[PDB]
Every structure is written in structure tokens, then in C-alpha cells.
Amino acid sequence: ELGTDPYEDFQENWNTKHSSGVTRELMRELNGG
Amino acid sequence: GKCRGLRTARKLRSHRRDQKWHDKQYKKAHLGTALKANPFGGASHAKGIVLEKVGVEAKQPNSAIRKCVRVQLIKNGKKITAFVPNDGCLNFIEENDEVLVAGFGRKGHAVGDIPGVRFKVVKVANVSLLALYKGKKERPR
């Protein structure tokens, strides 16, 4: 099952309260670390 | 520009010595007015007697009532507003008690929403607030 999309989360919450989280998630999706 | 002569050591040293006084922290540490005005007198901690309990309104945009205590130090007799940091710890302090007070963490500068408060309570009635909060020790009574 495909539950969470980091790209959508960042693009939607980049200016919200949960920005610092989603950015931190997006890097994990990109750099593999 | 600066002088680069071979015999200009006195000029350079004198200029640096005189221009060090325009540094805020060097002047604060070497002038003596701050040490005289410091209620602790340079100590890390102090002991005082709780004069009363007060509530300080948190600065905007935050809205809350920070519980504090007015105390009077034993060595010099100065009056100080100290913060009691925890959920419900103000019920561990009674009036006319003896408390240990330390700094707030910013070297005499106010921290957070609390205006003009730079001290916090550590131990009350010779027992630590952490032990009372975690229920490890009881009030002596």
C-alpha cells in the first residue's frame, strides 16, 4: 500500500507548522539517509 | 591605514588597549559596575527566604500566567523574583520558606515570555524540586 508521498507533503506543508518535519522527510526520500 | 613601522609596538599596543573598551562584553567584565549591580555578587547559586507568591503575565503573543516567588537573599538582603519551573510545583513552596535560587541560563538576561525574570528555584526546604515533582522525596514537615 502506498500511504505517504514526501513530495506532496513538502509541496503542501512547506509554509505550514509541519514544514520542518516534512522537509526532513523529503531528504530521507532523496538522499537515502 | 594602520602603521607598519618597525618601532611602532607602543602605538599598536596602546591603541588596542584603548579600543578594547568599546567591546560590550570586555567592558562589562572589566568595569565593575555589573558585578556591583549583580544581586548574587558573582555566585552561581544563592539562598533566600520566600516573601510571597506572584503571577507574571506572559508577554505577547503568548498568553499565560507564569508562577513566580518574591524572595529575599540572606547574604545581602536584596529582593529577587524567581521562577518555579514545573507543572504544579508552586504548591511545594510555602511562605517564609528557605529556597535555593540559580540563574535562568542567559547570564542575567530574561528568558522566554517572562519579563524581567532571570532566576529560578532549585531546592525548597532543603529538598530538590525534581525529587518532589517525581515523588522521590517528601517535604520534611
Partner: protein
């Protein structure tokens, strides 16, 4: 399938150019991304350095775009950097990867003391500038490692430098300028005239001039 649109691409596809150093020797601009894939191939690894949202004020409200910084390298003497701004994150990342592998430069490596074995550090002190950011690279003894901030360290590792001392001045919180300054400093290694390069240059046939008859056919 790859169909080149330039003479250099046709020469590379038809196996007329042996190595990328032939292209670097004649300072021929690279306009096709497939050449680097043909030469460097699997040794290339990339890493996203930053995703930065920028906004343009309009009548109805702000319009947001995302800028991706991607550094790439093969850890064996070549390094590149790319920046791409788009509406979507994935498109910007793909564009940044393409732009980074397009602008790939070689790195010259030297010795600190006795010249034994393979080179491990920069030939000399090199400085790069970008905005207010100044970055200085200094040779280091073998086994020292890279003494720098996290951002320049990744580019130095991807370039293939093992040991180096680093100095930096200016507002380095600007990640783009911080990366571009050290990229420029790394690029300046082959542009420094050292006494061991004082020999007179022997010229050679340019790939355009050498393979003109084959280019006429295709």
C-alpha cells in the same frame, strides 16, 4: 534511444573520441547530457543539497516555485554542480541533475610532501568567490582527511580529494553561494600555472579537424 544533434555528440556516439579529457583539452562546450553518461557512466553519484522555496508576489497572491541544488561526481577526479527551479519538486530535481552533469569539470590532485604513490590533496592553495562567500583550500598531509563544513565536504569527497584544509569567510548560511564558491575553488586547480607545467605545448589535431571527413558523411 539517443540521437545527437551536435557534431560532438555524433563523434562521441560513433566512438571517435576515446576519453572526456580529449574534450577538456580543446575546451569544447558540452551541450548534450548523454556524452557524460557515455564516458563516466556508472561511476557517477549525485546528492541533493537543498530544496529552497521562492515566491513571486502577484495580484491574487504569492506564486511559489522550488529550487533544487544537486552535486554530482565520480569520486575519481571529476565534479559538477547544478541548480534548477521549477513548479514541481521532481521536475526541478531532474533538471538539476541534468544541469549538474552538464557542467562537470576535472580536478587536479597533488602532494603535500614526498611524492610517493597516488596524489591525495590539492596542488596548492586555491580560492573561490561567490557573492560574499570566500572559500580557501590548502594542501594537507596524507591521512588528515577533509577539515571543512558539511556542505563543502560533500563536494570535496565527490571530487576525489582525500586530505585538505579549508577556510571560509562571509555569510556562509547561503547554501547556494557556499557550494558555488567551493565549486569554483575546485575548478581553479587546473588553471594554476605551476613550474612543472612550464614545458612548451605540442599541439594536436582537433576532433573537428581530425574527423571532418567522417562528419561530412553523417
Amino acid at each position: 534511444e539517443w540521437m545527437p544533434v551536435t557534431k560532438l555528440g555524433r563523434l562521441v556516439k560513433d566512438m571517435k573520441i576515446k576519453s572526456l579529457e580529449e574534450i577538456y583539452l580543446f575546451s569544447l562546450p558540452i551541450k548534450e547530457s548523454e556524452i557524460i553518461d557515455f564516458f563516466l557512466g556508472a561511476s557517477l553519484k549525485d546528492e541533493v543539497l537543498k530544496i529552497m522555496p521562492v515566491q513571486k508576489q502577484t495580484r491574487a497572491g504569492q506564486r511559489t516555485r522550488f529550487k533544487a541544488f544537486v552535486a554530482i561526481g565520480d569520486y575519481n577526479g571529476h565534479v559538477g554542480l547544478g541548480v534548477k527551479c521549477s513548479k514541481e519538486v521532481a521536475t526541478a530535481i531532474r533538471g538539476a541533475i541534468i544541469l549538474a552533469k552538464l557542467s562537470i569539470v576535472p580536478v587536479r590532485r597533488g602532494y603535500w610532501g614526498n611524492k610517493i604513490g597516488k596524489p591525495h590533496t590539492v596542488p596548492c592553495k586555491v580560492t573561490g568567490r561567490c557573492g560574499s562567500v570566500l572559500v580557501r583550500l590548502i594542501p594537507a598531509p596524507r591521512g588528515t582527511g577533509i577539515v571543512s563544513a558539511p556542505v563543502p565536504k560533500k563536494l570535496l569527497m565527490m571530487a576525489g580529494i582525500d586530505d585538505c584544509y579549508t577556510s571560509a569567510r562571509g555569510c556562509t548560511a547561503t547554501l547556494g553561494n557556499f557550494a558555488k564558491a567551493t565549486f569554483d575553488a575546485i575548478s581553479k586547480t587546473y588553471s594554476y600555472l605551476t613550474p612543472d607545467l612550464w614545458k612548451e605545448t605540442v599541439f594536436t589535431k582537433s576532433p573537428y579537424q581530425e574527423f571532418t571527413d567522417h562528419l561530412v558523411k553523417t
